């Protein structure tokens, strides 16, 4: 999240056009989703992470 957000902000500050800014921010957001397992392709990874979090919450309780 933090790295993709910083990349988005840097790209927007370095953007040469509005379409370049849009594309750079979209790519940053997609990267954040994938690495945070929030993209469509990481859905299996996201499910495994969610199951780990649920088991951690069960252990906590």
């Amino acid at each position: 999240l933090e790295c993709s957000w910083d990349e988005l902000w840097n790209k927007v500050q370095q953007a040469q056009d509005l379409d370049h800014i849009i594309a750079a921010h979209e790519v940053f957001l997609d990267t954040i989703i994938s690495r945070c397992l929030l993209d469509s392709d990481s859905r299996a990874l996201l499910n495994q992470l969610r199951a780990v979090f649920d088991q951690i919450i069960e252990l906590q309780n």
């Binding site: 999240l1 988005l8 927007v12 800014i21 957001l29 997609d30 954040i32 945070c36 929030l38 979090f53």
Partner: protein
């Protein structure tokens, strides 16, 4: 107000919010809590609905 978030700018702090998902019985707060960031106008061209959804997904996770 109890944390360093109080020191954020009012324009930033007004965009950081708590979103509650549709409350179901048996759900915990971890399943429904998310941060959101409202994007509109020209910034919505870079922070598209897909980008905002991905950011909110990472926030909630």
């Amino acid at each position: 107000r109890a944390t360093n978030a109080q020191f954020d700018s009012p324009e930033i702090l007004r965009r950081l919010d708590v979103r509650l998902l549709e409350v179901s019985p048996g759900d915990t707060g971890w399943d429904v809590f998310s941060l959101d960031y409202h994007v509109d106008g020209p910034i919505a061209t870079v922070f598209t609905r897909e980008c905002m959804s991905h950011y909110l997904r990472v926030f909630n996770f």
